[PDB]
Amino acid sequence: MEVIELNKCTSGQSFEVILKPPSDPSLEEIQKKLEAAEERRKYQEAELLKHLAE
Amino acid sequence: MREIVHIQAGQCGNQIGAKFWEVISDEHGIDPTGSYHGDSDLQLERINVYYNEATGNKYVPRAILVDLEPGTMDSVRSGPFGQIFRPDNFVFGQSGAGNNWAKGHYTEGAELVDSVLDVVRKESESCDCLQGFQLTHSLGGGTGSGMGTLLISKIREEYPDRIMNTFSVMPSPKVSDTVVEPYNATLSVHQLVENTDETYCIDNEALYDICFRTLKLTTPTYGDLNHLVSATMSGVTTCLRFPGQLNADLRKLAVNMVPFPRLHFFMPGFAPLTSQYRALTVPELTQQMFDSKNMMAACDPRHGRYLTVAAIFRGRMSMKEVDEQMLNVQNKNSSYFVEWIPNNVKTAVCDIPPRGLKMSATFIGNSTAIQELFKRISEQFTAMFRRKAFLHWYTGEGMDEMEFTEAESNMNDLVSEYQQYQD
Amino acid sequence: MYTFVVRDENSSVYAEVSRLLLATGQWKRLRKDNPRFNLMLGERNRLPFGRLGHEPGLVQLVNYYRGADKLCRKASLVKLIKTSPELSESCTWFPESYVIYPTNLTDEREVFLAAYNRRREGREGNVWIAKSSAGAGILISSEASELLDFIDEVHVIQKYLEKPLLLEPGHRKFDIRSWVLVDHLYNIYLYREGVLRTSSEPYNSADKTCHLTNHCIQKEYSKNYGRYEEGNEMFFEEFNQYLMDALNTTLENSILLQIKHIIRSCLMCIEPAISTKHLHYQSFQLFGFDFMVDEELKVWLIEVNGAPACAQKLYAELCQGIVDVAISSVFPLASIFIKLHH
Amino acid sequence: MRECISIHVGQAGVQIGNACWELYCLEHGIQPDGQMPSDKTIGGGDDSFNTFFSETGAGKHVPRAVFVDLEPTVIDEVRTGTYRQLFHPEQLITGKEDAANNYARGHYTIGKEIIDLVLDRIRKLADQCTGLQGFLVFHSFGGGTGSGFTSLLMERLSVDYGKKSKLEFSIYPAPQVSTAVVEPYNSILTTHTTLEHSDCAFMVDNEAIYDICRRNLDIERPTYTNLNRLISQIVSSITASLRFDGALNVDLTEFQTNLVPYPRIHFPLATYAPVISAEKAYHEQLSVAEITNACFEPANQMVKCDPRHGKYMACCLLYRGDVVPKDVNAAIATIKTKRSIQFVDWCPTGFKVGINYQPPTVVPGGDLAKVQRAVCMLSNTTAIAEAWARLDHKFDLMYAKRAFVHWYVGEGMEEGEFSEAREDMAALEKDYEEVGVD
Numbered sequence A: 001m002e003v004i005e006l007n008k009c010t011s012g013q014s015f016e017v018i019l020k021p022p023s024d025p026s027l028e029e030i031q032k033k034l035e036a037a038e039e040r041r042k043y044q045e046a047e048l049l050k051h052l053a054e
Numbered sequence B: 001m002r003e004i005v006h007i008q009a010g011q012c013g014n015q016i017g018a019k020f021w022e023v024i025s026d027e028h029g030i031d032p033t034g035s036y037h038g039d040s041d042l043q044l045e046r047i048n049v050y051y052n053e054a055t056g057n058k059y060v061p062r063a064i065l066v067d068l069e070p071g072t073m074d075s076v077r078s079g080p081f082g083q084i085f086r087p088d089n090f091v092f093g094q095s096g097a098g099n100n101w102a103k104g105h106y107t108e109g110a111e112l113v114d115s116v117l118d119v120v121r122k123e124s125e126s127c128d129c130l131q132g133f134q135l136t137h138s139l140g141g142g143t144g145s146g147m148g149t150l151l152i153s154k155i156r157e158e159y160p161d162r163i164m165n166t167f168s169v170m171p172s173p174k175v176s177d178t179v180v181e182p183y184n185a186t187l188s189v190h191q192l193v194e195n196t197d198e199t200y201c202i203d204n205e206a207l208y209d210i211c212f213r214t215l216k217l218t219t220p221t222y223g224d225l226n227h228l229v230s231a232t233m234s235g236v237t238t239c240l241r242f243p244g245q246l247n248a249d250l251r252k253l254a255v256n257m258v259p260f261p262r263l264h265f266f267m268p269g270f271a272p273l274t275s276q277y278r279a280l281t282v283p284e285l286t287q288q289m290f291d292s293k294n295m296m297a298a299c300d301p302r303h304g305r306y307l308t309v310a311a312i313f314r315g316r317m318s319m320k321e322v323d324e325q326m327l328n329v330q331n332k333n334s335s336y337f338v339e340w341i342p343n344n345v346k347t348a349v350c351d352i353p354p355r356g357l358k359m360s361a362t363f364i365g366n367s368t369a370i371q372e373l374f375k376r377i378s379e380q381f382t383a384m385f386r387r388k389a390f391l392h393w394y395t396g397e398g399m400d401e402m403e404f405t406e407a408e409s410n411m412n413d414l415v416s417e418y419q420q421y422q423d
Numbered sequence C: 001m002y003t004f005v006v007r008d009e010n011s012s013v014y015a016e017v018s019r020l021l022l023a024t025g026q027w028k029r030l031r032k033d034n035p036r037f038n039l040m041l042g043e044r045n046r047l048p049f050g051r052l053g054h055e056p057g058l059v060q061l062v063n064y065y066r067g068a069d070k071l072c073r074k075a076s077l078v079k080l081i082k083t084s085p086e087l088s089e090s091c092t093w094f095p096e097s098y099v100i101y102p103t104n105l106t107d108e109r110e111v112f113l114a115a116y117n118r119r120r121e122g123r124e125g126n127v128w129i130a131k132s133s134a135g136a137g138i139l140i141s142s143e144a145s146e147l148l149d150f151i152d153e154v155h156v157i158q159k160y161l162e163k164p165l166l167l168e169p170g171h172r173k174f175d176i177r178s179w180v181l182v183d184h185l186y187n188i189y190l191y192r193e194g195v196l197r198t199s200s201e202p203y204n205s206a207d208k209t210c211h212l213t214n215h216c217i218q219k220e221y222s223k224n225y226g227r228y229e230e231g232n233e234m235f236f237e238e239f240n241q242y243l244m245d246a247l248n249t250t251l252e253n254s255i256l257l258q259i260k261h262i263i264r265s266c267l268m269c270i271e272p273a274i275s276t277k278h279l280h281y282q283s284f285q286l287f288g289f290d291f292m293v294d295e296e297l298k299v300w301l302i303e304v305n306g307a308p309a310c311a312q313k314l315y316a317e318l319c320q321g322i323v324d325v326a327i328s329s330v331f332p333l334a335s336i337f338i339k340l341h342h
Numbered sequence D: 001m002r003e004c005i006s007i008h009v010g011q012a013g014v015q016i017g018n019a020c021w022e023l024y025c026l027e028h029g030i031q032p033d034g035q036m037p038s039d040k041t042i043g044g045g046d047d048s049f050n051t052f053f054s055e056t057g058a059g060k061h062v063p064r065a066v067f068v069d070l071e072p073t074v075i076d077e078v079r080t081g082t083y084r085q086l087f088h089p090e091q092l093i094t095g096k097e098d099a100a101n102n103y104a105r106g107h108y109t110i111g112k113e114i115i116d117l118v119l120d121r122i123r124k125l126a127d128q129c130t131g132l133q134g135f136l137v138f139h140s141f142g143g144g145t146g147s148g149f150t151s152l153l154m155e156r157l158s159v160d161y162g163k164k165s166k167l168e169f170s171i172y173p174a175p176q177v178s179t180a181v182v183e184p185y186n187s188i189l190t191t192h193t194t195l196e197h198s199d200c201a202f203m204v205d206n207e208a209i210y211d212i213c214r215r216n217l218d219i220e221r222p223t224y225t226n227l228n229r230l231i232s233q234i235v236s237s238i239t240a241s242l243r244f245d246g247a248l249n250v251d252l253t254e255f256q257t258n259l260v261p262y263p264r265i266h267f268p269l270a271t272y273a274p275v276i277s278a279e280k281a282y283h284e285q286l287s288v289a290e291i292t293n294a295c296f297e298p299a300n301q302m303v304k305c306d307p308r309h310g311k312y313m314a315c316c317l318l319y320r321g322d323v324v325p326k327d328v329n330a331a332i333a334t335i336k337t338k339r340s341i342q343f344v345d346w347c348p349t350g351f352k353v354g355i356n357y358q359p360p361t362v363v364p365g366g367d368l369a370k371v372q373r374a375v376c377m378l379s380n381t382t383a384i385a386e387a388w389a390r391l392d393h394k395f396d397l398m399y400a401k402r403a404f405v406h407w408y409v410g411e412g413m414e415e416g417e418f419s420e421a422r423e424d425m426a427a428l429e430k431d432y433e434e435v436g437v438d
């Protein structure tokens, strides 16, 4: 049971009580994923319009 | 401003569509002349979903009336709320369709569809954010069935990223006009399987039984049948017409109700169904709401399983007691809800009840038991097709037997698809 | 109409409980994977406690206490007794035990050898027993070298009670099995009916047939199975009469008082760790305590089984009691236990 | 002084953000019109409260916040709400059609079309910062925007503000108030793509907030307004150290240092006490030991789980009100001898304590009663993994049948991203079990 690093001020205070010692993707890649998904949508819609065309 | 464009085609579609606008126009305080005379701001909160606002504070329904005959539409224009519809939105021919899917879809209907799409385009061009479309029609006739599915296919081609919703009346020998209704219904069902996101299956067999068995109507008429459709259509659209958070628009509804693209045919239910001054408790609404006798599709829910369920309680009631009753139905009959879709039952509440009721409940279920309706149509179809009976009415319009064979196989596949998820 | 699921098909005890619940007409059994259940008869291994108590409008109860394995494991029980102040290393009703990990892997090898040499030098009885939780594999030897070499081929080594109370006629060993039920309120109920799993072979302080009282070992490797009592199972009525005719005492005074004391001390110890008082789901569990009695009429704790079976004659009575105090107390419908207050 | 920018995404993020900024103004004495009489440095200053509020030449204190939603209705509330004068139009971003509870629709389809606008608005606030610490992102797991667009924003933020910290306040989905069946899908999808981009996330399970309202506030059917008032209290207790003078959790970097020894395991459990119903005329004020002891009752946690059957990696006690260090230590010593508090061997067994003398502020007319002292415990327990198990199980049930998957594929998402995200959660659950189990 130890208390350390006691800091006090007007609005409060903080401290630490110890009870026992121990025993990213780039913008280019993100754009590719976003465009790859938009391309699959365009392909799916083109097939639908192709289907409706028949 | 998520606008919905309404379309009603054929005799059944216009007679039912007319009653729908008559019912919801009353709930929103809109009179036959389009003037608002309500007393609650909740009536106008989402009035633009179905109504346009013109000069003079007038509210004009965003509806398009289509038919190959002038008969039924002349009755609408002369009906109670006939003057509230936009005059230009009446698109009709003169030849009729003779209860012939081919006439509505390939010959007579083809000659008139482009002018209908011009009205749809005009209505859509003014929408700030178009949700999609809702169509009212029957599947047993020629115009609503044949031309109705033609419009859906052409609307999807021009608005592929919008939601397509339909109220589709299924034919039944108990309330039958012609013997070719199974032909017309089978041909249409395949169209609906491909080109709609949500289809409320309204079975004239169930509507007749409800009027006869429950409501005690010995000689039901189409007017009696359309009373149940008005109340049901009003209930299923409550979440779209009033402020809420569950299924508030067409796409979110489809996301909660359609786990697989082709299984998008719903069983609507309504409670109460009184043949009248007694107060209905929340437990009573729940029991009747899930009771087979209150289903509009003439399918036994206990013969299948619920993929998803949408419940809408209307009126001033205890939302706490509503949650209890809904959980009690699921927990007491959980064997009828598929266990691989957790929490597949969503409940919404609306303070404004329907006209003449202190409170009501509307049921929207995606059950695999709907296959019983498709099997029924499929059996009646095959009984005649195996002898090529009455086909000449269709081959005379350019159709070939092969197209019937394909429609037969398409619906038998749909039945098989429902059967795999029921186990 | 309450609902329950069965996730342990090999449970003879709860197979009867499930049979009784259905017979009441007020319980409906669901699929083992249906989450809308009131009661779960869960599996022994990896019961998903994390998914319990998250069903709106459903009071959920399970037949196992999460964390009770600390008491129902060979190595766990030893550590719990030594490290818990409520029990203390100076515990007088638990045999001197040590946790010995195999060399092919804390550990108490040196500590065990220290106490072993003290007995060898002191001329005292230095017979120990090695066992583990993965047994049917037990070794009883007086040489420490054989015990450590056997484990290498996790175990625990404790003192072997060399002076056990021997029933007459027969001069045979035995053990006492007590069934204890703990409900969602942490009431400790002791089933009035116990059983003595006696050995049909005379005890020899110099073959494991007369030393191990297991029911499977007596019915397989013993040539006197069922000679004195049916199925080598002597119930309290007969045992109590023997204590009166032979030792001039009763089962309550000479033994049962110590058993009740041990049951309370163990369960009261782990209560803060496993209690479901303020938890979003409730737990109960049936335990099987095994005791040894020496010639001085002193009771010793051997182990605690978390998924115990019951004697054939006592299945009905005990299972009904489980439904009455453990299941029906939480889900009422439309005493054979002794409450150990604390 | 170093600024912090708050970002509110989707309905849950916006409405929760609206509740927090309301509470901030009451705590700092800022009026709805933006004026702050106590602020003697007009038009500037580097005070503690300036980390969240900028100052105009006219003395207005503008929150360093951005609101984003693919639908205009929710953010229109803030445009005409009580504190509409606090924000300017540039801070509020709205679309026309939302993500329809579809992660793919929020991340790919609709997200791709507005991501650059949101970043441009974030850049405007960043340019007003002399030393930007990072961001606090509010959002739900279940919504299409909260889940789908947030993950895309978190990716870009890492690219545009690589050195800045990012903390989350995430709303875990609960069926009692949920609005979609696919919320488990969206929760796991957004956690997968956001894990590497978040330094510290505080999850709030609507189930826990819902029951706390019904149990401790006597609310029969809690609403979002009830839930958010309580959530903003916990959020206030967590961010108080950034807005007031102190020495504990003085910057966003200190949150990771004090609560996250392992990066992937960055989901601390929050427990708050006391929650008292304002409908009670008089209530016995709880002591330091009583509220501290309450921090170990599962019924007061933001996520229902049993910390007794896990291990701790760090633990912070945040007190607000009449609290002195002497009483804190006396309550901690007593709790050790009665509770099952197990730490990991490679970590000390202790508590970092922070005390702010100003007691908690309560919105006038709300449901929470005024209290003399309150505490919020931030504990990194392996027990919180129970929430992942529940979520992953519901995911497995639906995905085994591919139920609703066509909605995501239709937006351009590949089915493989489902299993990829699920395999990441599988590894996440495995990490928790290795740390907190023997």
Ligand SMILES: Nc1nc2c(ncn2[C@@H]2O[C@H](COP(=O)(O)OP(=O)(O)OP(=O)(O)O)[C@@H](O)[C@H]2O)c(=O)[nH]1
Pocket: D009, D010, D011, D012, D013, D015, D016, D069, D070, D098, D099, D100, D101, D102, D106, D140, D141, D142, D143, D144, D145, D146, D147, D171, D172, D173, D174, D177, D178, D179, D183, D206, D224, D227, D228, D231
């Ligand atoms: N605690 C709390 N949860 C909310 C609130 N609003 C929504 N939620 C939860 O958020 C989940 C749905 O996400 P939303 O934020 O509503 O959806 P969204 O982010 O707007 O994305 P969209 O799908 O495009 O509408 C549900 O599980 C709700 O329970 C709120 O105000 N407070």
Ligand SMILES: Nc1ncnc2c1ncn2[C@@H]1O[C@H](COP(=O)(O)OP(=O)(O)CP(=O)(O)O)[C@@H](O)[C@H]1O
Pocket: C095, C129, C131, C135, C136, C158, C159, C160, C161, C174, C175, C211, C212, C213, C214, C290, C292, C302, C303, C305
């Ligand atoms: N310290 C000890 N002193 C004396 N006998 C002991 C002993 N440890 C074990 N035994 C004997 O070994 C028998 C079985 O031991 P244990 O209970 O560990 O086996 P087990 O767990 O396989 C049987 P169960 O699970 O049915 O109790 C006891 O019934 C007892 O006869």
Ligand SMILES: Nc1nc2c(ncn2[C@@H]2O[C@H](COP(=O)(O)OP(=O)(O)O)[C@@H](O)[C@H]2O)c(=O)[nH]1
Pocket: B009, B010, B011, B012, B013, B015, B016, B097, B098, B099, B100, B138, B139, B140, B141, B142, B143, B144, B145, B169, B170, B171, B172, B175, B176, B177, B181, B204, B207, B222, B223, B225, B226, B229
């Ligand atoms: N419920 C209901 N069903 C109708 C109505 N009118 C016709 N039907 C059904 O619709 C089918 C006839 O289709 P109909 O609409 O008359 O054909 P269309 O005008 O060419 O599209 C038959 O199965 C009738 O039972 C009506 O007003 N209400």
Ligand SMILES: [Ca+2]
Pocket: B111
């Ligand atoms: Ca012609």
Ligand SMILES: [Ca+2]
Pocket: D039, D040, D041, D042, D043, D044, D045, D055
């Ligand atoms: Ca200033």
Ligand SMILES: [Ca+2]
Pocket: A024, D158, D162, D196, D197
């Ligand atoms: Ca990073």
Ligand SMILES: [Mg+2]
Pocket: B011, B141, B177
């Ligand atoms: Mg007709």
Ligand SMILES: [Mg+2]
Pocket: C303, C304, C305
């Ligand atoms: Mg055992």
Ligand SMILES: [Mg+2]
Pocket: D010, D011, D071, D098, D143, D145
């Ligand atoms: Mg939204």
